Design a binder for these strands. Sequence first.
RNA 1: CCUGUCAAACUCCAAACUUACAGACGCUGUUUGACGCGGGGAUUCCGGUGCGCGGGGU
RNA 2: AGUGCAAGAGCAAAAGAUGACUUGACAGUGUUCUUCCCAACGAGGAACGCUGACGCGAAAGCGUGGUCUAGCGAACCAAUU
RNA 3: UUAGGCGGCCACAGCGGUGGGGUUGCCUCCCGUACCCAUCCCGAACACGGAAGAUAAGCCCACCAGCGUUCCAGGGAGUACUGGAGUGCGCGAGCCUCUGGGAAAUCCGGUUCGCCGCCACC
Lengths: 140, 95, 160, 154, 186
Amino acid sequence: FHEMREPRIEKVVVHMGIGHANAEDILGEITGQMPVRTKAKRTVGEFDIREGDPIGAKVTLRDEMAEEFLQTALPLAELATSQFDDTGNFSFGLDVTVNLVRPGYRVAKRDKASRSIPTKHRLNPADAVAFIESTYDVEV
Amino acid sequence: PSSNGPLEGTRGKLKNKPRDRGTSPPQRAVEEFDDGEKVHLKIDPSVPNGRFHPRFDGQTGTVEGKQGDAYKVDIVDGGKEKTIIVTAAHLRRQE
Amino acid sequence: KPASMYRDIDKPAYTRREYITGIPGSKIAQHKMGRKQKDADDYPVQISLIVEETVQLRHGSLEASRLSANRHLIKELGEEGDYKMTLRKFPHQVLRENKDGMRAAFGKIVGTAARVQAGEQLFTAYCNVEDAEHVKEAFRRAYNKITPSCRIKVERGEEL
Amino acid sequence: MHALVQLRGEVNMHTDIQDTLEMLNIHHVNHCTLVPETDAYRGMVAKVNDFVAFGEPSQETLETVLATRAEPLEGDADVDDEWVAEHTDYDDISGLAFALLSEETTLREQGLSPTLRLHPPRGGHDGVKHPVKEGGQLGKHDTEGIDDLLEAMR
Amino acid sequence: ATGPRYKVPMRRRREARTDYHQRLRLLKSGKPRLVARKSNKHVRAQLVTLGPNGDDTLASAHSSDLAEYGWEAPTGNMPSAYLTGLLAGLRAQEAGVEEAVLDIGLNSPTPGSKVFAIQEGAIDAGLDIPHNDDVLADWQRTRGAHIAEYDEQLEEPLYSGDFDAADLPEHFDELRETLLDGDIEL
RNA sequence: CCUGUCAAACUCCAAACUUACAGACGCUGUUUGACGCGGGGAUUCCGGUGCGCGGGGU
RNA sequence: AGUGCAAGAGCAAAAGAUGACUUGACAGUGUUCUUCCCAACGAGGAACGCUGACGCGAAAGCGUGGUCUAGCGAACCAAUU
RNA sequence: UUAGGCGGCCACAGCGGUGGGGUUGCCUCCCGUACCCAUCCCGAACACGGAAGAUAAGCCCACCAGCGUUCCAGGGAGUACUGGAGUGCGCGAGCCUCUGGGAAAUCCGGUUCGCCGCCACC
Ligand SMILES: [Cl-]
Ligand SMILES: [Cl-]
Ligand SMILES: [Mg+2]
Ligand SMILES: [Mg+2]
Ligand SMILES: [Mg+2]
Ligand SMILES: [Mg+2]
Ligand SMILES: [Mg+2]
Ligand SMILES: [Mg+2]
Ligand SMILES: [Mg+2]
Ligand SMILES: [Mg+2]
Ligand code: NA
Ligand code: NA
Ligand code: NA
Ligand code: NA
Ligand code: NA
Ligand SMILES: [Sr+2]
Ligand SMILES: [Sr+2]
Ligand SMILES: [Sr+2]
Ligand SMILES: [Sr+2]
Ligand SMILES: [Sr+2]
Ligand SMILES: [Sr+2]
Ligand SMILES: [Sr+2]
């Protein structure tokens, strides 16, 4: 029962929203895979007249690449209670976000016959703290 | 009328009711009619192409052949006979 | 101008402010009178003024009528007496006047009127059994400042 | 089976109504036709309602009328029992009058003009400006009411 | 849902199983659709014609009934997919079906896919379907050669239940030849 | 929540009614030839009133 | 929301967005409706065909311009192929 | 249909909820990247290969009506409006009678938690 309900890391997205880049290098080193540019929409009075253009970069870590990155990432962060999303997600920081979810998230991410995950099977902020805490760190 | 265009005063007849909004079912867009058949003329607001002149909504002509995939339906405007090029999308079987 | 020019309902409903501009503001001061904190049901008596003919009453009449009607209640029951009157109709119908002979005759916007059908409640007062005579006199003065004849019908009050 | 009798003239009456009266084989004022009682025939009388006087006649009255105002399809000849017997499928006026009311045949089917050309109501009718319920003579009638008219216009 | 003005999608679009936009363009041909559908363990191929109350299936072939003629291998690979296509195409010939238009549904038009493998088989069966040779997988991959070369990197058997050690794309040859034969109880 | 009103350029609703086609009845046409087609000749393109529905305007 | 611009209308695995490819905004000849309800009238317009040549796609298919309704003009003279 | 594929109608089918179902069967979640294929970064998706585990998801099954929706009964209402007629009433705006039609809001009680087609299949 709990076997198919026990959480896992879907993805760890690390991003550095600058605004006008040269920062791609560091993420490539710390993570272990190629980075991608970050563009934006709508004109901004803070020297952002050119709509689609390089502003930042991100990396989506999955499986080993994600956990190995977290074995050294999590310690550097002072976790808190209000740092969680209602779906059991947390962002800390350079920003590092972790998407946590139960053993059958493919149903909602696939192409054919996709369905949105029922509220009962959706991860909770409670089950989130628990799972995470149960892996080398403290809550609150 | 303020202007003499095709869609003049067509606000209602060329608009779907809230629940009929969006793309329409393909079944009627490919329905096969035979020469001599009676068909009702009604434009499907959802379907852009293959339309007849709005002024002909509510007619019930007779399929007398087809040009390409679109049909050629004969109607009678007042007393004037007219041949109408119209796709299956805007046709329904009488009875 | 005379109400003769606008008392009848003989034109389309002209209310769409999204198409009409320069509409003179409503002379109507307040629609809720008396003690607007207390409810209608807290009163044993409910007497309403009923318009007998279908008409159009300008905000000038509405205000003049409503004013001289409530001013009596304030006089006879005090500024903070135990009553509560209401003017349920609002001046929605915009009015024009062609004020250039008959050429380009569509008139300019001069005012607003409230459309009322026959047998409707223009006013509705709520008071106690004792002060129910000062309410009938309030309406007697009110129906004189409007175009149609009226009925002062008691809706709640077998205390007669 | 109803007895239709035009009481109001053609001048000023709508064309769609006048054409209906003509479709009901009645072309002049005071002309009577014996119309069945179907869905179709019902719409027609309803349309003519304000320019006519109708109702179901008593066998007796229908006989007095047929005897006095019925005519061949072509001709000046009198339609009496002897006449009926010789040309119709009946034995006398009464036999005919019965089949009509029961809606078994039609005046035309029996070689009789579809129209019973009546005479002005003796002692005058109740007025062509009001229906029967308002004391007038227009619209649907009581069987006794319709008889009074027909008998008066024999 | 929310109220009167709300617009609920068509049931099959709601379920997210049918792309009506491609279905209409597909129905414009006037030919029967060669419905190519997959599954994790299986792969089927239907021949659907239109109808008054709903679609009409004249012919079909499920990878499951493939074993019925001699298949002993799995049922969700390239040899499986092609062979299902060919079987389906034959049963179609039987009902009088002479031409079809490939329908892959919500599946992707990837070069060498199992849907194109199915299409390849149905055409081989003697059907007339608008295809594109260079979008189809190469004969050997259709045979399942890439699977045997994967088993070459052994150390641990590829198939749990014993079918054989190094696998057999020759089984494919045997079965393909079995279907081309006139006898066979379709 | 409670309470007071509206829409020629609003509509979750919604007539009467008008209208396409077909059947039925009615009426009509096959010596009075209808329906339709071809050709000759016009006059006419200052209208008005009543009723119903209007729009403008005291 | 967006879809160049009035207003009304159309569109969500799109008609909107991003991407890459492409230039069908191609040559030619028509059918029908519209222009002009009924009901004759030109230019213009649209839908729908066919022949040829192209672009895209796995393919069905889509492309006779921009989702639909405005953005248009006789002979004569002039230039041009 | 002891869980499948393609559909028609396109909410009576929505929203929300409850309970039940899978040793070689099915759909899945699922395990995994040598290949065809894939990500402007990620076998996430897509694509390919496969079964150690599971029925918690999805899906299939049974059921709840609170919201939304379809329909039905009574109430509202033959009321509002209206086609036809009137030497009926009203200073008038306007109303009334006869004739043929006939709502809507809303209340109340029921209905609806899809139906049907083709194919395959203990
Ligand atoms: Cl047309
Ligand atoms: Cl599939
Ligand atoms: Mg309109
Ligand atoms: Mg004679
Ligand atoms: Mg006398
Ligand atoms: Mg008299
Ligand atoms: Mg010149
Ligand atoms: Mg030149
Ligand atoms: Mg369960
Ligand atoms: Mg009078
Ligand atoms: Na639609
Ligand atoms: Na002037
Ligand atoms: Na032209
Ligand atoms: Na870029
Ligand atoms: Na489950
Ligand atoms: Sr007026
Ligand atoms: Sr007065
Ligand atoms: Sr009209
Ligand atoms: Sr277009
Ligand atoms: Sr995986
Ligand atoms: Sr007066
Ligand atoms: Sr009735």
